[PDB]
Design a binder for this molecule. Structure first.
Ligand SMILES: O=C1CC[C@H](N2C(=O)c3ccccc3C2=O)C(=O)N1
Ligand SMILES: [Zn+2]
Length: 111
């Protein structure tokens, strides 16, 4: 298409470039996974094969992982520090991916 308006995802709080709709990843047959943490917070997580502009904090943990066989690290916006989701590693097909919180991103046109 010409002039697509739903191409890239930016940090909602600051505008840092984070990911792309083309990089959505259907984990378990769906890119969307609705999950809760031990504090009871519900997240609509979109899985992406790739992302940029984040800062991955600390070492991986398997504790409470929403995705079998993966360990996670918190992913902050590398610009403003907003908690955007998690990076998953240590698993299989794929070894790694990102789970980002949908409502913490803004979607819009490319570049
Ligand atoms: O797959 C995941 C990613 C991390 C996530 N997580 C949280 O969001 C959290 C908040 C406070 C204490 C502990 C946790 C934790 O494990 C969680 O529960 N599962
Ligand atoms: Zn940000």
């Amino acid at each position: 298409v010409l002039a697509p308006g739903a191409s890239i995802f930016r940090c909602r709080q600051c505008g840092q470039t984070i990911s792309r709709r083309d990089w959505l990843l259907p984990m378990g047959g769906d890119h969307e996974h609705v999950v809760f943490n031990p504090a009871g917070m519900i997240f609509r997580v979109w899985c992406f094969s790739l992302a940029q502009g984040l800062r991955l904090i600390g070492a991986p943990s398997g504790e409470f992982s929403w995705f079998k066989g993966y360990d996670w690290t918190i992913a902050l916006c590398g610009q403003c520090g907003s908690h955007l989701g998690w990076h998953y590693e240590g698993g299989s097909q794929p070894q790694t991916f990102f789970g980002l919180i949908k409502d913490r991103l803004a979607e819009g046109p490319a570049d």
